[PDB]
Amino acid sequence: QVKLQQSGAELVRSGTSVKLSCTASGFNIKDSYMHWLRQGPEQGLEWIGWIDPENGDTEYAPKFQGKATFTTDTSSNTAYLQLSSLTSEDTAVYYCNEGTPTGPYYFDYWGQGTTVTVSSENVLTQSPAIMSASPGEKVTITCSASSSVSYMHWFQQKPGTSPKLWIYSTSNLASGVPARFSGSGSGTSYSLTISRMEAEDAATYYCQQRSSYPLTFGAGTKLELK
């Protein structure tokens, strides 16, 4: 079993720097690219960048260029994220994420997250921001992009857990996703549908495009059980 274990919560004062770590187990980080993301209080996901643990190539989202620094220790199979000049604005849950390096994004692992509390672009639009459904109802959520994207991916997130790959490459279900779910679309318009809602489907759903940097997510659709 693959596990990405992150370091514990950090309580820091504005102005300082932290270094978080993420150690993989049952997977060699060198085999793909380690992504670092952050989920703010508003619960929106932001991509920070990736590092190629094999040759140290890195790609930082422009917003984090300068603020973040990725380094690795392949010997221990660990990736580090160093944030600088923290401000109250950086208070968030930081995640490390690694999945399929090429081709269909069929596998994906997330760290459990590290909460850092600071003491003082292809924009995707999801609709609707929130909705309610009773088990048995049909559900259709959309996600439109600013510029055409090759594929669209979807992640489901329940309260207190990290995101879980749900649908990859527009219409393929991730491992363990029930058949009642389906995805589709093309160009700049995509959607996720649930034929018949189940109580267990209530969660927040995010669409993500991996076609251009910085990778972006939709703000999410909270699907509440009615």
- DSSP string over 142-197: EEEESS--S--EEEEE-TTS--EEEEETTTEEPTT--TTEEEEEETTEEEEEESS-
What token pair was written down for 219? Answer: 């703000």
Are 1-120 and 121-219 in the same CATH fold? yes
Named by the residue before each, gaps in the chain exceeding 2.5 A from C to N are 120
Q: Which residues pair with 126 in a beta bridge?
A: 143
Locate tokens 């219409």: which residue? 171
Element (H, E) at 96: strand 92-99
Q: Which residues pair with 119 in a beta bridge?
A: 13
Resolution in A: 2.4
CATH class of 121-219: mainly beta
Cβ–Cβ under 8 Å, residues 121 and 214: yes
Cβ–Cβ under 8 Å, residues 60 and 38: no
Cβ–Cβ under 8 Å, residues 138 and 194: yes
Determine the 3-state secondary structure of 220 from DSSP: coil
What kind of fold does domain 1-120 have according to CATH? Immunoglobulin-like (2.60.40)
Cβ–Cβ under 8 Å, residues 50 and 81: no
The Cα–Cα gap between 115 and 97 comes to 15
The Cα–Cα gap between 16 and 44 comes to 24
Sequence spans of domains, the chain: 1-120, 121-219
What token pair was written down for 70? Answer: 């990725």
Element (H, E) at 21: strand 18-25
Q: How was this structure determined?
A: X-ray
Determine the 3-state secondary structure of 7 from DSSP: coil
